[PDB]
Design a protein around this ligand. Sequence first.
Ligand SMILES: CS(=O)(=O)NCCNc1ccccc1
Ligand SMILES: [Mg+2]
Ligand SMILES: [Mg+2]
Ligand code: NA
Lengths: 240, 49, 815, 334
Amino acid sequence: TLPSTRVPAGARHPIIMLAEHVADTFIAMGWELAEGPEVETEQFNFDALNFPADHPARGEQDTFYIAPEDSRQLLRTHTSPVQIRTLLARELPVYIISIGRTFRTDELDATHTPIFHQVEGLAVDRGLSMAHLRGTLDAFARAEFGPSARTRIRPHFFPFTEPSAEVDVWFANKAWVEWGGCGMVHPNVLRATGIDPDLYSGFAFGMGLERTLQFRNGIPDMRDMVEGDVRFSLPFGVGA
Amino acid sequence: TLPSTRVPAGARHPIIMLAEHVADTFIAMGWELAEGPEVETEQFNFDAL
Amino acid sequence: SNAMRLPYSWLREVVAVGASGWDVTPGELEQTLLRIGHEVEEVIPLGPVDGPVTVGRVADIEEIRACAVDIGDRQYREIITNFAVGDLVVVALPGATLPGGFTISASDGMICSAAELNLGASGILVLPPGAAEPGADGAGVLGLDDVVFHLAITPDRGYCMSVRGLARELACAYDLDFVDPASNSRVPPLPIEGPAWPLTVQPETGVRRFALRPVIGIDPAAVSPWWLQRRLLLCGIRATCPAVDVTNYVMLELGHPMHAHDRNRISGTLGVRFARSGETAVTLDGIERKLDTADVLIVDDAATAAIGGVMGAASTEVRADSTDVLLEAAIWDPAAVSRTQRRLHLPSEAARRYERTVDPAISVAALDRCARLLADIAGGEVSPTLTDWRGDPPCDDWSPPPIRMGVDVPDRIAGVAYPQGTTARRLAQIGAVVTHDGDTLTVTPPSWRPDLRQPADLVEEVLRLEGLEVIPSVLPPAPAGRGLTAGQQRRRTIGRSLALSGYVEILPTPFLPAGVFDLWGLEADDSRRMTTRVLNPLEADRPQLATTLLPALLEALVRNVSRGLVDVALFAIAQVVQPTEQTRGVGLIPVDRRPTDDEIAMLDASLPRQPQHVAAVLAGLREPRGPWGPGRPVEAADAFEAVRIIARASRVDVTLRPAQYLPWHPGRCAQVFVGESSVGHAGQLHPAVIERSGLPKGTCAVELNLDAIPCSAPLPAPRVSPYPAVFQDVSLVVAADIPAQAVADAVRAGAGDLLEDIALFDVFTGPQIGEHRKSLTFALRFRAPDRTLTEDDASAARDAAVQSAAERVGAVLRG
Amino acid sequence: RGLTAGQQRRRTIGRSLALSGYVEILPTPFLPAGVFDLWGLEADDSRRMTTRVLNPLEADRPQLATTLLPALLEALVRNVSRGLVDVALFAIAQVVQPTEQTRGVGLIPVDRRPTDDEIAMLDASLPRQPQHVAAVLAGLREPRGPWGPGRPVEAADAFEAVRIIARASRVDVTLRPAQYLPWHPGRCAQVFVGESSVGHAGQLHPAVIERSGLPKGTCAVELNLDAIPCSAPLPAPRVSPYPAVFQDVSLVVAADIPAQAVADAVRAGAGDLLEDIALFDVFTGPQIGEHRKSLTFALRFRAPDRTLTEDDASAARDAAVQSAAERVGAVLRG
RNA sequence: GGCCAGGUAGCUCAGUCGGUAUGAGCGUCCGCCUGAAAAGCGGAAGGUCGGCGGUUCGAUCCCGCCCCUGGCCACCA
Ligand SMILES: CS(=O)(=O)NCCNc1ccccc1
Ligand SMILES: [Mg+2]
Ligand SMILES: [Mg+2]
Ligand code: NA
C-alpha cells in the first residue's frame, strides 16, 4: 500500500476538456471544426454579421478595440467571424462548429469574465428549418447534461439571425437554466457571403463554455476557472 | 543536447491504432462502433448468415 | 438604458377597450410576454400594507416638523418637509405594518413617503387636492393591488416602448380585438384653422415630421390629477406640472415623445438645423452642453430651444408660472439621435425611443391627445391652429415598401404545417396589409414596424405568435464529415502527453503584465516588444497583446507558488499576436455582395500574425519526495524533456542547439529545430530575469511554435531480425563544447546499418581527461538482418564509427 | 452517438500505459501447453476451467485463455531471449471463462426473427468473455544514462501500473495484501474498486519464474475492466485564498500495519482542515523496536474562510494522532 | 461626473495626521531538538505603505491628476 507514483499526473483544463467533449459530439454527427484569429477585422466581426453602423456593441465600452481609434480592428466579441470565414472559404453544404476564445468587456468576478470560451455552430444547407436547429440543440444538451436533458427556445433578437431565440436547458442533476442563443441565419449574412437565400437556409447557435461548466458542476467562483490555480485543475483528472 | 528521457515512451500496437483510425473515420460520418464475443454460437456465425 | 416599466392596470385598461373583461394572472401575463419574445426583468407587486394606513389632510405645522392630520370622521392625530397646510398626505397610524415588517406605533404614527410604501422612489408623498377624501383607505387610493412589469425591450421592437405597443402585442397573443389608443375614431381630431407657429426645417438633418399646436391660458397653480401622477411614478417618471406630466404621459401611452415649450419665450421663427462647431446650449437640467456638427438643434431668432430628440433647453423651459404652452411633436433621425445622446451621456426617455424609431403616423394624433389632456387638467384653451411639417414634398403615406414571400414560407422555416390562413392572419394581426396573388403574399408592414424589411422578418412574426413550442425536434441528416484535422488531433495528443507527464494546463491571458519585457531585459528592437495595443483595456497598465505565452504562464506560476503550491509544472496551448506593421485596417466592404478573394486576402494581410504556440514553465521539485527518496528539483534538462515530449506527440524529430535568447539563461538555453527550421526555445531562465520578476529560483520554461512544426504521417515498416545481437561500448574523448548528440550522430554514421541502437550512459571529466575536454561512453548494439555476427564484424563497424567521430567532431579513442 | 464510455476508456488506458513506457502486444487466446502446471495452481482453480478447441493448429494448445498473463509472458520471453531484456508490455483483450461444460443450442429456424427468450438462451450457452487489461515487466524499469545507472523493475512498478489504469478510468482503487498465484505472496496486492475485487498486481512468485524460464523479479498486473464501473465525476473545486499551515507528524506502528491505513486514520481525524497528506519517510532503525516502523507524513492544513494558527493546526494534528492510535494502534514518535 | 471609504509583507488583514510599520496570523530562513522531520522553545530575513510630482534636515501620515476598488448624496422632459 506504499505510495508508488514517482511522477504525479497533471491535468488538462476543464474548459479544454469540455470543449473536446463538445467537439466529439458534433464530429459524431458529421460536423467539423474550424478556427479563426482572435484579433479580427470589424468587417467579419460586425459588418458581415448584419450589425448596424450605429450599434451599441460597436462602441468602445463593450468591445476591445485595437489602438489607434477607428482602426476597424478589434478583439472578437464572439466566434461568429470564424463561421463567416468558413462560409466564404468552403463549399456548400456547411456543418461546422467553432470553439475559440472570446473577449467581452465584463469585469472579472464570481459569475463573469472578460476572457471566456464559447462554442458556436453553423449549418447551411438546402431546406434547413427551425426543427433541425431544435433537433441539434437537443442532441447537444443530451450529450452534456444527460439523457433526460431537453432544450427550450424563446423568441429574442440577434443582428445575424432572423428569427432569433434564446436557449434554455433542463437537467435533472441540479429547473430550466439560461444556456445560449440561436436562430436561423439572416439572409443578409448569406448575401454577404455569396449564398442565395432562396436556395439555402441555415441556423446557428452559441453557448459559452465557462457558463456551461459553472451551473453543470456547481462551481461557485468562476475566477477559479481562468486564474490557473493548480488546486482547481487537478481534481478533474488527467484527461487522456 | 544530452539525453533527458528518463522514462522511455512506449508504443500502442499499430493494428490497434489502425483500428482506431478506421473507427474515427466512420464515426465522423455518423456511424457507431459495436462489439461482440470471440466465442460465438454457430447460429449467429453461419446459420443466420 | 433598455428598460420599460408600466403597471398592469394601465396595460389591461388599453387591452380591455377592445376586449371587455380581459384580465389575467400576473404570472400568466409574464409567461405570455416571454413566449412572444419580451424578456421581463422583474414583476414587482405594490405595497403591501394592512391595518390603519389612511389618507389625511394637514391641519397646521409646528416646527423637523410637527403637524396634526385629519384622519377622517373629525378625528385628529399629531405626527412628528415639502408640504404646507391643506396637502393630502398618507399616514401610517399605529397598528399598521408597512412593507418589510416595519410596524408603526406611538407622535401618533408616521408620515408616509413613496419609498417605504413600495410605490416609487424623496421627501413625503403629497396627493393632489381632490385626490381622495381625508380618511379613505390608503391601499385603495394608492392602488397597491397593482403590479409593475419591468421589461427589457430588444432594439428591434421600439414600438413596444409604450402601452400602445405592448397592448397590441397582448391582443395579438390572445387573439383579441384591439382598439389603437392613437386612432382618430374615438373623439374627432382637433380643428386646423391655420398655422400654429412659423418654422423652417433643413431637409438634410433627418427630420421626418415636425408638428406644433399651442394651448393658451392654463392655470399655473393647477396640479396633475392623482391617476396621472401615479402612473408616471410606476413607470419611473416623477411628476412636475401639468404641462410636463402630459408630455411624459402621452410618451408612455402612445410611444411618441412630446415636449412642451413656453409660447411666451419663443422669439420668432423656429429653426431645425445642425449645430455649429463649439456651439453650446444650456439644457433643461441647467447643464451646459458642448455640441457637435452632426447634432440636430431647434433654434429661434435668439437662443437654442432644444437638442433634437434628446432634451429641450432652458430657453423655452416650462416653469411654474407658464400659461401659454406650445407643444412639439417631432420625428428625428434615429442614427443622429443615437450618436448625439451617447456622445454627451443623455439616455433620455425620448432619445431611447427615437434611436429605436418612432411611428411617424401618430405625430398629430399624439399632439391632439396631449393638447386636449393639458387643457382638461389645467383649464386651458386649445388653439385651433396646427403646423404639420411632413418633409418636402409633404409625405401623406408613411407605409414601408411592400414585401413578397410565399404563403407557406413560415411553414418551411418553422418545420410545422400551420393551419391554412395562419400566416395571413398573424401578419394582419400585427397591423400589416396582406394581399393574395396565387401562392405569393404581398405584405405591407405598418408604419410603426420599420424592422419588417424582408421575408425573414415576417417569418419571425408568424412563428413567435404561434409559439416556438410547436416546432418539433428533428435531428438533421448528418453530412459525411472528415473528422478532426491533423493539427487539431495533434493538439490533443500534445495536451494528453504533457498532462500525463505532470503538467497542469492553464488558460493564458493575452494582456501582458506591465513592463514584462523590461523585467526580461530585452533590447528595444526585440520582435516580441512590437506588440498590438488595446485602446480600452480593463487595466490601463496592460494594453499590449501577447507575442509570447511565457508572461501569462509565469503569472500563473507566481500565483501558485505564492499560495503554498511551490512545486508547479504548467503549460498552455494558445495563439499569440505578432504584428508585422503598424495597426492598419481596411475600409468598409459593401455587405450586399460577397467580398472577392483579393479583398479577403486584403483583410488577412491587414491582421497581425497569430500563430498557435505551446509553452510550459516549471519550478520547485520536478519529482516529489516520498518513501523512494527526497525527490528531484527542476533543472534545465526537464525543459528539454518537455520538448521531446511535445516532439514525440507530434511524431517529428527535433534537434537542440545552444543559443543565447532572453529570458533564458545563456549557458542553459536550447533552440529547438525541426529539420533546419527554428521552432522555439527551452531551458532555464536567466537569474536576473528571475530576480527582477519575483520568480522562484531555477525556474525553467519552454515555448514552441506549433505552426512552424510540419505535420507528419510516417508509415514505418520495421523488419525484426531473428539473429542475435552484439553488445559493445566505446569511449570517445572530445572537446567540452562538442555536443553529445553530434558525437552520437558521427558514431551512427560510421557504424552503418549494423548499428541497431546507441545510448549514452557516461559523461566523464576529471584528472584522466585534459582540461576543457570530456569523455563519453556509448552503449552500442549491433545486429545483422540475415546472419549471426562475429566479434570482429562488430568491431569493424565500431572502428568505422571511431573514424567517423574522429573526422567529424575530432574525437579521440579513450586510451 | 459516437464512442461509448467503455470504448473511450479503452483508448485512454492504452495512451496512458504507452506514455508510461509500456508496449502493446496482441495476445493469443490459445494458452501455452501446461501453463497452469508451471504456475502451480490448484486443480480447482477457476482459471483452469477453460474452453477447449477441437481442431487447433497445435494439438498441445487447445484451451482458450482465461487470463492474459500467459500470452504476455510468452511475448516477454520472446523479447528477453532476443537481446531486449528491459521490457514492459501490456495488452487489452477479452478472456474466455466458461461457467459450465460446453452446451450447444439446436438450430433455430432462420425463416424468422429469434424471440427475445431464444436470443437470451444463445447468450447464456456462451462462456463469459469479460475485457481485461494486463501487463508484465522485467529488467530495468528506467534505463541508464548520464543521470545514473537506472532502476530495476520492482513490485511498486506494477502497483503504479494499477494507479495509471485507475487514473485513466477516473476511479479510485485500494491495494490490499493478498496471496494469489502466480504472484509473490509477500509482494502481491489485490486491487479493489470500492469493495469489489478487480484484479491483482505485484511481483511474480520465484518458483513460477524458475519453472517458466522467466527473468528474475518479473512483475505483472491483471485487471478486469468489466468489473470497474464507468464513472462520470463532476468536480466542483473551491480554491481557498487563505494561506496554508505545514506540519509533519511521525507515527510508530507495527510492521504489519499498511502505510495507507495509517494515512486513512490520520485523514479521518484531522477533519476538513487537512488539505493534503503525503508519506515521505519509513524508518526502522535501532531506536525503533523490532517488528515496528516509524512513518512520517507531511501534512498541509488550510481553512476555506480564515487564516489558521499553529494551535488550530495542532488541534487537527493531535486529533489525527488520536484517530491513528484508535485505528492502527499508532504511537506518537518520541 | 461633485463627496467619502479604501490599495499596507509571500497569503489574509490590522495600524499610524513626520525621524521604530518595535505590525499580526500564517508563509520563508537559522539554532536547540530528531536517524531525517514537525510541533515546542529561542533567534532572524523580507515592505521602497498604489503610481508620477509638489512642500521639509526628514514623508506611508502633508496639497495636485491617473491606474482600479465596492459604496452614499446630486442629476433623471
Ligand atoms: C451569452 S452568449 O455570448 O454566449 N450569447 C450567444 C449568442 N450568440 C449567437 C450565435 C449564433 C446564433 C445566435 C446567437
Ligand atoms: Mg436575454
Ligand atoms: Mg424581427
Ligand atoms: Na543537463
